[PDB]
């Protein structure tokens, strides 16, 4: 129960450790999803004189 | 989280290493009390 109780600690902590690196990874990828939005704003340059 | 993952990675490796060492270091302190009582 040193091994079992500290491994029951670790088997959950490694899941949250992996999920927090995956949230950091999904957020450094969501930087590229906001960069496709910034690319739309960069392409709107485009159109003609109004009235 | 990884601080407590490194905590088992001391704890487990330590209880395994201390088990197989102190088996001989304390068995060789019961063997000498058997010498004193025989």
């Amino acid at each position: 129960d040193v091994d079992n109780a500290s491994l029951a600690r670790l088997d959950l902590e490694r899941k949250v450790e992996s999920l927090q690196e995956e949230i950091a990874f999904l957020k450094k990828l969501h930087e590229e999803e906001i960069q496709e939005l910034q690319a739309q704003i960069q392409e709107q340059h485009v159109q003609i004189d109004v009235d | 989280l990884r601080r407590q993952v490194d905590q088992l990675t001391n704890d487990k490796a330590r209880v395994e290493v201390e088990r197989d060492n102190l088996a001989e270091d304390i068995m060789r302190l019961r063997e000498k009390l058997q010498e004193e009582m025989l």
Partner: peptide, 30 residues
Amino acid sequence: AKQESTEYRRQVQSLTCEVDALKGTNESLE
């Protein structure tokens, strides 16, 4: 799997000392 391999290591170490002591009892009868 490392925690199971650490519990079976305690079972190994306990059962080794138990059968080493029963062997040491049979040598003591000898």
